[PDB]
Amino acid sequence: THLFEGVGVALTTPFTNNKVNIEALKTHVNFLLENNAQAIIVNGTTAESPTLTTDEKERILKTVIDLVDKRVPVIAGTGTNDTEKSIQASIQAKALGADAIMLITPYYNKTNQRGLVKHFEAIADAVKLPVVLYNVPSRTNMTIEPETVEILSQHPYIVALKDATNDFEYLEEVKKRIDTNSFALYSGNDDNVVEYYQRGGQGVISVIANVIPKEFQALYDAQQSGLDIQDQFKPIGTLLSALSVDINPIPIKALTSYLGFGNYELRLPLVSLEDTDTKVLRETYDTFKAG
Amino acid sequence: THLFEGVGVALTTPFTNNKVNIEALKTHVNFLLENNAQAIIVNGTTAESPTLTTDEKERILKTVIDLVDKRVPVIAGTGTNDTEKSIQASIQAKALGADAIMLITPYYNKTNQRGLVKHFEAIADAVKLPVVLYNVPSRTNMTIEPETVEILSQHPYIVALKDATNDFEYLEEVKKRIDTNSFALYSGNDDNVVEYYQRGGQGVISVIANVIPKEFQALYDAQQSGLDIQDQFKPIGTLLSALSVDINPIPIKALTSYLGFGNYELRLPLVSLEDTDTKVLRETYDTFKAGE
Secondary structure (H helix, E strand, C coil), X not given: CCCCCEEEEECCCCEECCEECHHHHHHHHHHHHHCCCCEEEECCCCCCHHHCCHHHHXXXXXXXXXXXXXXXXXXXXXXXXXXHHHHHHHHHHHHHCCCEEEEECCCCCCCCHHHHHHHHHHHHHHHCCCEEEEECHHHHCCXXXXXXXXXXXXXXXXXXXXXXXXXXXHHHHHHCCCCCCCCEEEECCHHHHHHHHHCCCCEEEECHHHCCHHHHHXXXXXXXCCCCCCCCCHHHHHHHXXXXXXXXXXXXXXXXXXXXXXXXXXXXXCCCCCHHHHHHHHHHHHHHHCC | CCCCCEEEEECCCCXXXXXXXXXXXXXXXXXXXXXXXXEEEECCHHHCHHHCCHHHHHHHHHHHHHHHCCCCCEEEECCCCCHHHHHHHHHHHHHHCXXXXXXXXXXXXXXXXXXXXXXXXXXXXXXXXCEEEEECHHHHCCCCCHHHHHHHHHCCCEEEEEECCCCHHHHHHHHXXXXXCCCEEEECCHHHHHHHHHCCCCEEEECHHHCCHHHHHHHHHHHHCCCCCCCCCHHHHHHHHHHCCCCCCCCHHHHHHXXXXXXXXXXXXXXXXXXXXXXXXXXXXXXXXXXX
16 A cells, blocks of 8 residues: 555754754654644655764654654655665664655766666665655756656565656656556655645655644645645745745744744754744744634 | 866776775876876765765775875865764864865755855864865756855865866856966866866866876866867867766776776666676777877
8 A cells, every 4th residue: 555645744853052852853743743744754854864963863763763653654764875874774774663764866976777776676675664765856966767666666665756856747757657556656845736636646745744734734635535725725835935935944944943843953064044034934934824 | 376287086996896996096096196197086976985984985095195195186075965074074084194175065955155155164164174165066956156156265275166067157257256376276077178278277177087197187288388179179079978978987987997997896876887888988998099
């Protein structure tokens, strides 16, 4: 079947004075579960994984796993641009209790399509746990071509794709090529959801659900039931345009902190929004909530 | 005032049965020095730094430094998308004796221009060695804006830019803003050197100079003496076209192994060329050499 359907949260990392704050992470995760998140996706870029130490990643994953306590799937981002290191992080995540792992394509080194297959399959064979492929060309400069998706979807452990392609010709080429009964397609881009849902996607792995999980999941449920969400989505679109102001997770963290999850901090090389922009974004959020 | 001028080599890592071949590293570095390479850039993408263990990176850089023995600068690629990590690798590089560090912009996470300054300067302040900034939007998806390049050149230890934008309006905008007498502009794209040299660049940091260092440096020496290199470049251009068959360093290692620097191996996620393509590529090298 599927790991989940609807909204997964690309969970942010709460910092206090540059330290991971466990009490706040616990509080955030519980807030997510209570507000209908269908999965917690851990240590992705939204969590700033490129600057987390291996230890922090481990502390964060175990905390999430143990708190969530089997309530929804916990999906650990473990792939990096190094295949051996990816195998090892994946193996360790399995041992900690992850329900699944998520593997970005290589980046910075990149690789070719045949090299992708080798890489993804090496890790999936080693770990034998559901694998969510992650394709985001605006951060990797490479893609998982549709024919590469069919090949990979044929692997018994590789069951899903987070597609932040934001390219609807590519989604259509992928659907023609897989079986959604057993291979799920999740948008990696909050603001394409109305069309992504309408085109047969299984849900979304979401930034904005870090702070509006209830209304984002409720948007999914509405259309799944047969309703039109094109207009319903607008007030959310307005909030998403405000979030456009800088590279994720620089803006979203202004909102997680605003809700009391960590201070407003980002680890170098990221930097927090300046005062003016922080205030505007928070106000745009308050405005969404009143309505 | 520059670290070097002309051709620096983005050094490739020699693997034999998936292990760094130290004697081949040594033989290769002497080959480069003897064919007038002007600098050696260690542990970059061309060296497959993303798949090297911390141990390997360090054995590789210690070998190069001790062998080069201060003959040309040895510039350690140390930057990564991770500031803190980048600082510690850079302090370790200095302690092994590197002359300069190279610091690509962040990638995957990326950052904005303001954060770029904080990233590069925090490393620059902490290591206190000459820094070469490296901008390669086709692998990072971000850029160091000309006005950002300007700001960073004020920094005491930021002395150069390896520029792989392959964008000449960009180049001219950066020239307008910095002083090339004290801030060097090195191309990072082997195939634009003819234009890069006519527009006042200080050299190149090169992939193909892994195997034809003598020719590639002589091409620079030629235009520098006031000779036109446009036509003289073509045979080199022909070889580079053949090198674009796949993603660096996948093709170049088909040629370094060919010259006996390691076997033709790449660490996953990269894979070697199919050996049919490996054959075409080697013959094309051979054809370049025979033309001589």
